Amino acid sequence: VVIGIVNNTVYDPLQPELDSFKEE
Amino acid sequence: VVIGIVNNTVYDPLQPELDSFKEE
Ligand SMILES: *[C@@H]1O[C@H](CO)[C@@H](O[C@@H]2O[C@H](CO)[C@@H](O)[C@H](O)[C@H]2NC(C)=O)[C@H](O)[C@H]1NC(C)=O
Ligand SMILES: *[C@@H]1O[C@H](CO)[C@@H](O[C@@H]2O[C@H](CO)[C@@H](O)[C@H](O)[C@H]2NC(C)=O)[C@H](O)[C@H]1NC(C)=O
Ligand SMILES: *[C@@H]1O[C@H](CO)[C@@H](O)[C@H](O)[C@H]1NC(C)=O
Ligand SMILES: *[C@@H]1O[C@H](CO)[C@@H](O)[C@H](O)[C@H]1NC(C)=O
């Protein structure tokens, strides 16, 4: 719906904790 | 860098949940 939008990734601080818990 | 900074702890509302969840 927005003109001029650009593809990119947005970092999320929770996922590193999710991975850390899965490792442990 | 900052002049007059003071040592202290900053509480994180998320970590305690994973600490409680860890042992399971
Ligand atoms: C951003 O990336 C998505 C894919 O991740 C692009 O979406 C594709 O666009 C092409 C051409 O319009 C379509 O044929 C595909 O079906 C689309 N795929 C999906 C999953 O949507 C999108 O065009 C990209 N946009 C920009 C500005 O680069
Ligand atoms: C805050 O505490 C840290 C230690 O947790 C202090 O850092 C030490 O400072 C002394 C003296 O400058 C050094 O000899 C040590 O090597 C430092 N250790 C570390 C880990 O940094 C710091 O000075 C304290 N700051 C205040 C304002 O109290
Ligand atoms: C910006 O201007 C160029 C001129 O060639 C055009 O191709 C492009 O689509 C325009 N994009 C936006 C977001 O205005
Ligand atoms: C505040 O003033 C005192 C005066 O004795 C000085 O010792 C101290 O370093 C000063 N601290 C700051 C942050 O201005």
Swiss-Prot record, chains A, B:
Recorded superkingdom: Viruses
Glycosylation sites: 7
Role, per record: Subunit of the fusion protein that is processed upon entry into the host cell. Mediates fusion of the virion and cellular membranes by functioning as a class I viral fusion protein. Contains a viral fusion peptide that is unmasked after S2 cleavage. This cleavage can occur at the cell membrane by host TMPRSS2 or during endocytosis by host CSTL. In either case, this triggers an extensive and irreversible conformational change that leads to fusion of the viral envelope with the cellular cytoplasmic membrane, releasing viral genomic RNA into the host cell cytoplasm.
Protein name as catalogued: Spike protein S2'
Encoding gene (name): S
Whole-protein coverage range: 1128 to 1151 of 1273
